[PDB]
């Protein structure tokens, strides 16, 4: 008993979100105001690194 699932909860499956995605939710939720650099990164989102 304890960590006896090789194929299960042992291997986390948490989605990886960048700054562009995280900031989009906070601004919409009304928790944080829109900064001046928010639009700068919107037109040129960062390249994915997990799949590389």
């Amino acid at each position: 008993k304890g960590a006896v699932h090789y194929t299960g909860t042992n291997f986390r499956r948490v989605q990886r979100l960048d700054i562009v995605d995280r900031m989009r939710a906070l601004v919409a939720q009304g928790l944080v105001d829109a900064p001046l650099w928010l639009s700068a990164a919107e037109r040129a989102p960062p390249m994915e690194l997990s799949n590389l």
């Binding site: 700054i19 900064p35 001046l36 650099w37 990164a41 037109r43 040129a44 960062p46 390249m47």
Partner: protein, 148 residues
């Protein structure tokens, strides 16, 4: 001489592939070009003490001094998302626990040796920048900024 085990499998590094560097610089340049156009933009150049080639100031804004008592992974650069708008970290391996939930873009510059051995730095770094020769960041950025 060496009396240790000799490795057999040679791992390949695709993140720092010579062809991949073409798109890395092109994508990074677009982000910086749009940011500098706006007024009142400040950046942060975070390095390491061993980097003697890079001059550093005496005081550092946003630095918080804490004690050992009640310091369960305290965030040093917690208030560094007010005055600054872009941090260029040079040692992602050391500054990994503080930049986990940072609200600013991190332009980290690591090396293939550390990336393969410490893939955890990929989640904190947003824009990945290559580093030719991958030996010492102190003398690496100086050459780029003093080209021709």
């Amino acid at each position: 001489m060496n009396f240790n085990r000799i490795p057999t499998r040679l791992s390949t590094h695709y993140v720092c592939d010579p062809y991949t560097t073409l798109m890395h610089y092109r994508r990074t340049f677009k982000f910086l070009q749009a940011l500098k156009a706006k007024p009142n933009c400040r950046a942060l150049c975070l390095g390491n003490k061993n980097q003697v080639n890079i001059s550093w100031p005496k005081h550092f804004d946003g630095l918080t001094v804490v004690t050992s008592a009640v310091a369960a992974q305290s965030s040093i650069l917690s208030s560094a998302s007010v005055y600054y708008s872009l941090i260029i970290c040079l040692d992602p391996v050391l500054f990994a626990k503080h930049l986990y939930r940072i609200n600013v873009p991190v332009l980290g510059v690591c090396t293939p040796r550390e990336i393969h051995e410490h893939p955890e730095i990929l989640k904190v770094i947003d824009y990945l920048l290559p580093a030719p020769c991958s030996r010492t960041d102190a003398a690496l950025r100086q050459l780029l900024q003093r080209e021709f």
